[PDB]
């Protein structure tokens, strides 16, 4: 009785009365999945909710998101309800249902007092990392598809291809301040993984901005002089002046390098129009040098992380707003887009594949003669091919480099390429000199489906023309990294399933516990120029000892001192190379870790807390790139052997041996 | 050369390449696949006439009542296929075969008695395939991938470095059955030639050869060879065999005339087995040593001393020789083996198999199969003999012993299909050979060793399943029978031939419903391959290799058109120019060049035969005739693309479409253009939305007529003629005489399919584009159908694109676009659902459709009738009715109050409630169309009798066509006849038509015979073929139309692989203006040209342009109504393009009212004919930009659309061609948050379905578990929507706004300490 | 069921001191912001 209520037990499922179905199982109400069936798959559906496809909404501020009106009225009816008999506008709850029944225009004004400052949570299907789940504020929008601000979509990693987002609901008050607390958009701006700033200006952005802080040699107003770049606004904005011309400019720069206060400081530049404008954007603690460079996307990474590290997080985030809205007015503004003109194909490209020809002609010659084999000609073919391919390089990048030469005091006089191509080719975009030698040039050498390389490379150019056997090549490599998406994301989350069955429970408990000991933080310095170095390891920990100076006995950084960026910095100016440095696995704290043992970054910068369970981030952010994993010794530089670990002995004409394995070259 | 459609729109050829191959029908694939399947052949056409020669003369034991074949006969299709899509029964013909009865005489040389030939007898149905290439089955029509699996003969591969992990590669291989089994090979370094079954465990060869009974000696001899020894005068000579001395090491002087030729020590290679040939001397001095250690054969004891020390195959030493030698032994007979080629992997196989009797041999070899239990001799010996002996058990037909001699490179394509020992073990021998060095493997990648069992071939074998699950239902009956009992139709049946052959026509695995939304998609759903076959491959096993394409696949196979997920190199499609074969392999079109002139003899090969031959390429400059301009021309031997000569041309690449596929033959400009862009392009023109109106392409290539003419979405004519009665639904053609069937006249009638469902819900219809008052030409057209417009492929719409990125309206995938799109509508499609209604009686209550609802007012019946059906032409959303559903409740469900008024008041009251057909929340349509199928017996009231009375009268208007013409022509007839019996002309205008008399009377008559009983007909099928489903036979299927737009959200692209979503479409108030004003349309992004490389889009873009610009020229210089000479010249300028090719230009017929006409067709652009690979050049685009308004670089100067300042450095414009996919917001957008989970549980309401919330995945847990604040993910899966009553108390909580709780033991969670509580361990809570 | 075992049979009495516990059964675990709300737990659990 006792067994065919829990699960038959477990000798044989006796079956009911004179039917085909064994007596009822409460084990199968207590092991299905997961345990139970909320936490298993499938357990619950989310109301407070709208799983609803994207859209841009290039005009969103930062901190908030767009919702469709119809789905508001379906989400928010009870709080709409809670409202209107808390003041008591509606008659009765029925009547209220009945008011939304007649789509009554004051149900949707109390729709105002249910959204207007009541923020929301958004989430993505198929999101692995803890950077797809964040916050924004509403902004009532007519329509059916959630809106977004543009750059936030590479955090979630969603480009338009049918995301469709669930934006939840935060009901609770805990929950609403958590929403715009850890969970805002303009807070977790830094990546768990690493200290950089988590978006970097995708494209359209930077060209607008590429186009904004500019050089041309033809340009209009070159040398006049502007004290105010709102005034360099009724310039280029109006159409008087170009957004190129070298004006010189007071730029009136601020310095925080007071106790908190900006520092007034005069100064004059040689800037272009759209530099003085880009003032108009760039708050006064940052410098004007920073933004007196062409920008590119590397340019503008750092750029918005030096604002951070230096002015602050406000001031940063309200710019990055301002950055967003004229990166793309600029683009419009932008006007040169694409040309036709841009694709040219030096006469030298036809010149060296003639030579390609007649030269592999001859190697091949060579096999009718004997001297070079099959395989020695299969390697020598890839052989002088590699060096007409990197000879035509030499033509097209130096053709896209110098070209564009337009008159100014003189007959003619060269600037970069304003060929729109190079644009992305110095912005660094979208488009590099691999993509760009794939298009204006010859492909290279491909792999073959075996896994290999084809000898013969793709002849021509697929700007102009190749034909189907040269495609059977390229079909393999395009195919092959459609196969990797394919199953590397399945098992990814896999991944993290073995990590968080490994981690969850480890929490962070105390901040300091009562050791020296720490591990060592050694730059990696393999092959040739080190592959990891020294600060990147420390950046966020704390120094395990008294750390001394290659000065014997002189601390250069007291035993608990936390290692941010001004010490990272303070650790790379110094000649101190091996830091030991107090490790998470050397903590003293048992069930747990101390603030110090770990450190402070993640989203956050600062000291982790006793509360913040390390455990389960951990696991994420290992698995978050999982879905992304797949002779002589000449040295080309200039240093000086220093042989370690080694007896070297001295022979005949004074040359020098090595008697062991055990044996590292350095170059000090 | 001009057709009446080619006085209305000829395609502007670009002519390059000479036209040479002429499309064929491309679906033969499918048709004549099925030609060889189904046709009348004496000769025994592989297919039904060889199937049922193969198994009939069918006898069985003991019966004698042997049952032959003869031939068959089909039905007559069952529809039309409009009936069979409409009610959707099976588009097929009864099979009738002719079978031959005979019962023979017991104790008698076997006489004839009774010859009861019952000819046609049914043998179930065949599913007939329609003459487009599709299966109308189920009510829309269907299709199957062909599939490619290996081909039957005998194959080698190698595994080299892959057998061992440590130096020793291998090279094995496996003998590949039709019909049959597979005998696979373990070859291996070890020096062993194992045999195994199929997939079995690893055997000896002689496990069998002993289990034949083979001894030692009678197996290594005719392995091995005998090398002849002599001892004369007590000294070791040697009889020299140099080609036995292949591979061995020379340690010995071997000499010959004294001269020493191979010396000792370097081995014995290649050049000094011939220096031994070279003077011919064969006797050589060798030292005793070397003949120590080899194995004799006969039985060498001593014959001279009288003892028995050794048996057989034992070595021979300084011992045993020793005492052969001082006996006087002369002639020793040895057997040969050595290390480096021949080894002796039959010498290390004998003892492996520890018998030396086929008893405990099959013992073994039954002890392999299954292991405890016990082998008997007699079963095993019979199994044997009746499995690659017996027939009916294993084949190899003409393409078994085909493939199987040519990699034997014998002779004979044809011979037995049971094994041949001869050539068998020749295969074994030869598997020695290749793991010597005497010999190659081959690769899986060789078509030779492929085989494409077409749809009709796939067939075949799928009906052999059929026929022999019967076929237990003919024997026996012939065993249980006795003399005439047993008779056709008495042993055959019907219902396995349905679960058969309808088993392959609906329920295979590559047989799903055609994705009908773009008839390309149609068409490259019927020509595909499919890797993933019946006995095929797989992709939970294959990494990458199945999907990674081979060169010997160049000139049938195009990988372009394939899916993203893991169906890439799975789901391939074919080459428009390939032609079936007959063993299941390709036929390739390949000019035969005669060593100088390409003559057009059009040979056929394979990839069996491209590697023998070497041929021309076709993007090779030739000159007028096809003498090669230049002294080379670059060929392929073997699929090598190398220099090659004007005379070492075989063949030569025809067409520069041989080796295209459809999909992207669409795509132009290929030879430019990224071949990812191209993969994502083809992908997303089998996505190409059915839009209202259809505009054909700007620049084309000549397929679009290819695919809008050759699928069924258009109404072709078999015959010519003046229309006759144009409407929308009908297409009435007065065919023209000599061409008109001289029995019975004849006249077209053609239905078209009016606004109805789709496979994707869109909606079809062909629509009538040749008006009234014209005739047309034979194998012309009439309608075109949708994502098609006058005979050409139109996908999409092209019009008005600038490249500029306008304030991140274009960010990432962002495409923006004009208000006057969604203005306009010309871009609405048009969505019907169609929803089914069950009922028609229970048990407990016999369903009506309501006919009345309970409780409510007169509301759910103003809009329905007497009968429940509501009206057609209304329009629904949200939740109403369509029709009322009654349904059985309960005396469950009844008060004792409500017990007393069902004594007083009625049963049928309150007995069956009112459970209509509701429309869920969320669902919006328009009443069109409301299909009732009436139980067939007892038919509904007169609201049906108001349809049927309907489509009654749709019979009449259309059966009065038939008799009306004749009645016409024999009237005339009478008129003339009548005047020779009595002249009375004016008399029988003034009398009636009853006035060859004879005759006439009677045709007319017949006409009117067959008129009512086609009514009848008609009717009959209107009446009672209503029938659906056993016990529902009412079901009510209403059409719900709707209309989607397109709106910020949409996902836009383009045939050339860009893709992009509307992020806000602006009024057209802000559109950049050109020089004149004009307002663009699309403005998209620049700054994924360099990246993604889509550089053939812009050149089209550029010669769309043009394909304008030339039309804006016409336009202003039309309305200003000029001669038809001006425009004319215009027109030369435009049919000349430059001076180049060709075009075939107009002034054959009258040009006035055909160009002129023309003129008005070209004033809104140019559809042109373009080559892939040799297309349009630079400046052949500007010569057309030029000869209209357009600059050199087509980088118009337009003005800001919100200001008014011109963009710097002129904007890239022109008109690009669209391509939507149909990924609408309407399927993705589940705005539910909760509306009701399920009934038995809180399990959730589907997943892409209807209240559709946020799916609460796994990895969302684990996420929310990253996050520090436990409590958000706390409530939200336990608390909130877990808590049945939890919630609840949090709806009654927060529906007065006050978020305070406490913890949340899940109640379920509390039965987990109670089902422990029970067991002994009883949890608590202390303090 | 193996857990069931496991488990059972010792009594292992885990005070939920673990995340995945504190969910199971719905309520605030002893760390983010449930750490002062189980502090107040904590010392008032076989204390004060």
């Known amino acids: ?668 | 050369v001009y057709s009446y459609t080619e006085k209305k729109r000829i395609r502007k050829d670009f002519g390059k390449r000479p036209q040479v191959l002429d499309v064929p029908y491309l679906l033969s694939i499918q048709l004549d696949s099925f030609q060889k399947f189904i046709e009348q052949d004496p000769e025994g056409q592989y297919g039904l006439e060889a199937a049922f020669r193969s198994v009939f003369p069918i006898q069985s034991y003991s019966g004698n009542s042997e049952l032959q074949y003869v031939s068959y006969r089909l039905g007559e299709p069952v529809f039309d296929v409009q009936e069979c899509q409409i009610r959707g029964v099976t588009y097929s013909a009864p099979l009738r075969v002719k079978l031959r009865l005979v019962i023979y005489e017991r104790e008698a040389p076997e006489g004839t008695v009774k010859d009861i030939k019952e000819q046609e007898v049914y043998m179930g149905e065949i599913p007939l395939m329609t003459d487009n290439g599709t299966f109308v089955i189920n009510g829309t029509e269907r299709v199957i991938v062909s599939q490619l699996h290996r081909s039957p003969g005998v194959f080698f591969d190698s595994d080299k470095g892959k057998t061992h992990s440590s130096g020793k590669v291998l090279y094995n291989a496996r003998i590949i059955p039709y019909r049959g089994s597979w005998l696979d090979f373990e070859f291996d370094p070890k020096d062993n030639l194992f045999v195994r079954i199929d997939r079995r465990r690893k055997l000896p060869a002689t496990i069998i050869l002993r289990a034949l009974n083979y001894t030692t000696e009678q197996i290594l001899d005719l392995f091995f060879e005998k090398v002849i020894f002599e001892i004369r005068d007590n000294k070791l000579q040697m009889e020299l065999v140099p080609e036995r001395l292949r591979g061995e090491t020379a340690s010995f002087d071997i000499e010959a005339n004294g001269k020493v030729y191979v010396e000792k020590g370097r081995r014995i290679t290649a050049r000094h087995i011939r220096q031994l040939e070279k003077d011919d001397v064969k006797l050589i001095e060798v030292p005793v040593e070397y003949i120590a250690g080899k194995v004799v054969a006969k039985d060498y004891i001593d014959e001279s001393t009288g003892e028995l020390i050794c048996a057989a195959n034992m070595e021979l030493s300084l011992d045993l020789l020793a005492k052969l030698s001082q006996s006087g032994h002369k002639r020793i007979e040895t057997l040969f083996t050595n290390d480096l080629d021949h080894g002796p992997y039959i010498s290390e196989t004998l003892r492996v198999d520890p018998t030396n009797d086929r008893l405990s041999a099959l013992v073994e070899i039954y002890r392999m199969m299954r292991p405890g239990e016990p082998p008997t001799r007699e079963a095993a010996e019979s199994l044997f003999e009746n499995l690659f002996f017996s027939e009916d058990r294993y084949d190899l037909s003409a393409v078994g012993r085909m493939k199987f001699n040519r990699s034997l490179l014998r002779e004979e394509i044809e011979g037995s299909g049971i094994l041949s020992k001869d050539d068998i073990i020749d295969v074994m021998k030869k598997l020695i050979d290749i793991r010597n060095g005497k010999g190659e493997v081959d690769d899986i990648d060789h078509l030779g060793n492929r085989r494409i069992r077409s749809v009709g071939e796939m067939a075949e074998n799928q009906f052999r399943v059929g026929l022999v699950r019967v076929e237990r239902a003919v024997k026996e009956r012939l065993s249980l029978g006795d003399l005439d009992t047993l008779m056709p139709q008495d042993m055959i049946n019907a219902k396995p031939i349905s679960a058969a052959v309808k088993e392959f026509f609906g329920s295979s695995q590559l047989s799903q419903f055609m994705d009908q939304n773009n008839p390309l998609s149609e068409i490259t759903h019927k020509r595909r391959i499919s890797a993933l076959g019946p006995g095929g491959l797989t992709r939970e096993r294959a990494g990458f290799e199945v999907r990674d394409v081979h060169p010997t696949h160049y000139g049938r196979v195009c990988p372009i058109e394939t899916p993203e997920g893991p169906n890439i190199g799975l789901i391939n499609s074919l080459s428009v120019y390939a032609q079936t074969n007959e063993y299941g392999f390709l036929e390739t079109p390949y000019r035969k060049v005669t060593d100088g002139v390409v003559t057009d003899e059009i040979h056929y090969l394979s990839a069996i035969e491209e590697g023998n031959y070497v041929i021309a390429q076709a993007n090779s400059n030739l000159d007028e005739e096809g003498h090669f301009v230049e002294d080379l021309v670059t060929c392929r031997s073997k699929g090598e693309s190398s220099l090659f000569s004007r005379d070492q041309v075989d063949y030569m690449d025809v067409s520069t479409q041989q080796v295209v596929s459809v999909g992207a033959s669409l795509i132009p400009f290929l030879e430019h253009d990224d071949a990812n862009r191209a993969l994502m392009g083809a992908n997303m023109q089998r996505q190409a939305v059915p839009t209202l109106r259809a505009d054909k392409p700007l620049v084309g290539t000549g397929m679009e007529r290819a695919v809008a003419v050759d699928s069924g979405v258009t109404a072709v004519a078999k015959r010519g003629g003046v229309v006759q009665y144009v409407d929308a639904s009908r297409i009435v053609i007065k065919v023209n005489e000599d061409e008109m069937y001289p029995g019975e006249a004849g006249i077209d009638i053609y239905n078209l399919t009016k606004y109805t469902r789709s496979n994707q819900n869109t909606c079809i219809n062909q629509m009538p584009c040749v008006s009234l008052g014209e005739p047309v030409e034979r194998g012309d057209v009439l309608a075109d159908g949708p994502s098609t417009d006058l005979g050409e492929l139109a996908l999409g719409q092209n019009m008005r694109v600038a490249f500029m990125p306008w304030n991140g309206y274009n960010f990432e995938d962002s495409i923006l676009v004009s208000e006057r799109v969604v203005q306009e509508d010309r871009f609405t499609t048009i969505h019907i659902q169609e929803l089914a209604c069950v009922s028609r009686d229970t048990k407990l209550g016999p369903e009506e459709i309501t006919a009345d609802i309970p409780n409510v007012g007169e509301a759910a019946l103003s809009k329905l009738d007497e009968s429940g059906i509501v009206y057609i032409g209304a329009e629904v959303t949200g939740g109403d009715i369509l029709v009322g559903k009654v349904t059985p409740k309960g005396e469950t469900q009844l008060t004792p109050e409500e017990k007393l008024l069902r004594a007083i008041f009625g049963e049928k009251a309150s007995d069956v409630k009112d459970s209509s057909l509701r429309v869920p929340n969320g669902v919006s349509g328009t009443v069109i169309d409301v299909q009732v199928f009436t139980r067939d017996g007892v038919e509904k009231d007169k609201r049906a009798l108001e349809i049927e009375e309907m489509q009654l009268k749709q019979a009449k208007k259309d059966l009065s066509e038939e008799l009306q013409i004749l009645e016409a022509g024999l009237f005339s007839r009478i008129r003339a006849v009548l005047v020779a019996g009595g002249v009375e002309a004016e008399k029988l205008d003034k009398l009636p038509r009853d006035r060859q008399l004879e005759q006439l009377a009677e045709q007319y008559d017949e006409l009117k015979h067959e008129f009512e009983k086609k009514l009848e007909a008609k009717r009959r099928k209107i009446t009672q073929g209503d029938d659906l489903a056993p016990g529902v036979l009412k079901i009510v299927k209403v059409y719900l139309a709707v209309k989607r737009r397109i709106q910020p959200g949409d996902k836009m692209a383009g045939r050339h692989g860009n893709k992009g979503v509307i992020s806000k479409i602006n009024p057209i108030e802000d559109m950049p203006y050109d020089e004149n004003g004009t307002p663009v349309d699309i403005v998209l992004n620049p700054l994924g040209v360099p990246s993604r490389m889509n550089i053939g889009q812009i050149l089209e873009t550029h010669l769309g342009m043009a394909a304008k610009g030339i039309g804006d020229k016409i336009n202003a210089m039309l309305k200003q109504q000029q001669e038809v000479a001006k425009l004319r010249e215009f027109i030369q300028r435009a049919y000349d393009l430059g001076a180049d090719v060709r075009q075939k230009v107009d002034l054959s017929t009258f040009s006035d009212e055909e160009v002129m006409r023309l003129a008005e067709n070209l004033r809104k652009g140019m559809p042109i004919a373009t080559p892939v690979f040799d297309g349009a050049k630079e400046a052949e685009i500007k010569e057309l930009l030029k000869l209209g308004d357009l600059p050199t670089s087509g980088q118009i100067r337009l003005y800001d659309g919100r200001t008014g300042e011109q963009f710097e450095r002129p904007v890239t414009v022109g008109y690009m061609y669209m391509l939507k996919l149909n990924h609408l917001v309407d399927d993705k957008m589940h705005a539910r948050s909760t509306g009701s989970y399920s009934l038995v549980t809180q399990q959730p309401l589907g997943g892409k379905a209807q209240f559709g919330g946020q799916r609460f995945g796994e990895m969302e847990v684990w996420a929310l578990e990253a996050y520090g604040a436990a409590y958000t993910l706390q409530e939200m899966l336990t608390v909130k929507s877990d808590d049945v009553n939890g919630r609840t108390k949090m709806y009654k909580n927060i529906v007065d706004g006050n978020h305070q709780m406490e913890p949340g033991m899940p109640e379920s969670f509390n039965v987990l300490l109670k089902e422990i509580r029970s067991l002994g361990i009883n949890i608590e809570l202390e303090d | 069921t193996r857990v069931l075992t496991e488990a059972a049979v010792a009594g292992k009495r885990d005070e939920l001191r673990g995340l995945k516990e504190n969910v199971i059964v719905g309520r605030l675990i002893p760390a983010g912001t449930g750490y002062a709300y189980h502090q107040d737990r904590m010392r008032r659990r076989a204390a004060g």
């Open chain 1, 1 to 668: 009785a006792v067994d065919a209520l829990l699960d038959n037990g477990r000798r044989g499922r006796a079956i009911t009365g004179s039917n085909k179905r064994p007596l009822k199982s409460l084990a199968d109400m207590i092991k299905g999945k997961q345990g139970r069936f909320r936490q298993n798959l499938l357990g619950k559906r989310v109301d407070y909710s709208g799983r609803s496809v994207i859209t841009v909404g290039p005009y969103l501020r930062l901190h908030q998101c767009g919702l469709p009106k119809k789905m508001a009225l379906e989400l928010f009816k009870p709080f709409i309800y809670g409202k209107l008999e808390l003041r008591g506008l509606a008659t009765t709850i029925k009547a209220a249902k009945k008011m939304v029944e007649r789509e009554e225009a004051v149900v949707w004004d109390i729709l105002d007092e249910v959204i207007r400052e009541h923020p929301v949570l958004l989430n993505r299907a198929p999101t692995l990392h803890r950077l797809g789940i964040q916050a924004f504020e509403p902004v009532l929008i007519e329509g059916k598809a959630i809106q977004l601000h543009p750059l936030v979509c590479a955090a979630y990693n969603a480009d338009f291809d049918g995301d469709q987002m669930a934006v939840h609901v935060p009901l609770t008050l805990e929950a609403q301040l958590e929403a715009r607390a850890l969970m805002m958009s303009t807070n977790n701006i830094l990546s768990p993984a690493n200290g950089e700033p988590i978006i970097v200006p995708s494209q359209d952005v930077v060209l607008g901005l590429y186009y904004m802080t500019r050089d041309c040699v033809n340009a209009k107003g070159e040398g006049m002089v502007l004290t105010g770049p709102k005034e360099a606004e009724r310039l280029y904005r109006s159409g008087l002046a170009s957004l190129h011309a070298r004006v010189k400019v007071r730029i009136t720069e601020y310095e925080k390098d007071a106790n908190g206060e900006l520092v007034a400081k005069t100064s004059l530049k040689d800037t272009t129009v759209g530099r003085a404008i880009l003032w108009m954007i760039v708050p006064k603690g940052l410098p004007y040098s920073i933004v007196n460079q062409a920008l590119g996307k590397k340019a503008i990474s750092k750029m918005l992380n030096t604002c951070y590290r230096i002015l602050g997080l406000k001031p940063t985030v309200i710019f990055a707003d301002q950055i967003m809205y004229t990166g793309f007015a600029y683009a419009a503004r932008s006007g040169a887009s694409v040309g036709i003109d841009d694709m040219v194909i030096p006469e030298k490209k036809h010149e060296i594949i003639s030579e390609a020809e007649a030269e592999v002609a001859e190697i091949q010659e060579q096999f009718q003669s004997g001297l070079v084999t099959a395989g020695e000609r299969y390697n020598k073919v890839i052989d002088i091919w590699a060096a007409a391919n990197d000879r035509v390089s030499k033509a097209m990048m130096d053709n896209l480099q110098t070209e564009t030469v337009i008159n100014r005091d003189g007959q003619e006089e060269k600037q970069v390429s304003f060929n729109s191509i190079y644009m992305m080719a110095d912005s660094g975009a979208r488009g590099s000199a691999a993509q760009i030698r794939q298009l204006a040039g010859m492909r290279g050498l491909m792999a073959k489906p075996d896994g290999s390389i084809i000898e013969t490379p793709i002849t021509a150019n697929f700007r102009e023309g190749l034909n189907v056997l040269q495609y059977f090549i390229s079909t393999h490599g395009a195919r092959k990294g459609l196969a990797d998406t394919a199953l590397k994301t399945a098992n990814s989350g896999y991944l993290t399933r073995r990590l968080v069955d490994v981690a969850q429970d480890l929490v962070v408990t105390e901040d300091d516990c009562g050791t020296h000991e720490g591990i060592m933080m050694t730059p990696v310095i393999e092959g040739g120029d080190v592959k990891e170095p020294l600060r990147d390891r420390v950046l966020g920990r704390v120094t395990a000892e008294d750390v001394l100076k290659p000065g014997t006995a002189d601390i250069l950084v007291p035993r608990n001192t936390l290692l941010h960026e001004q010490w990272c910095d303070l650790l790379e100016e110094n000649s101190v190379d091996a830091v030991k440095v107090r490790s998470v696995v050397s903590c003293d704290t048992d069930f747990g870790v101390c603030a110090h043992c770990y450190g402070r970054d993640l989203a956050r910068g600062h000291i982790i807390n006793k509360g913040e369970a390390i455990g389960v981030i951990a696991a994420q952010s290992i698995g978050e790139p999982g879905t992304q994993l797949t002779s002589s010794i000449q040295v080309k530089n200039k240093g000086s052997i220093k042989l370690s670990n080694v007896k070297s002995v001295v022979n005949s004409s004074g040359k020098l041996v090595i008697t062991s394995r055990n044996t590292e070259l350095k170059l000090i």
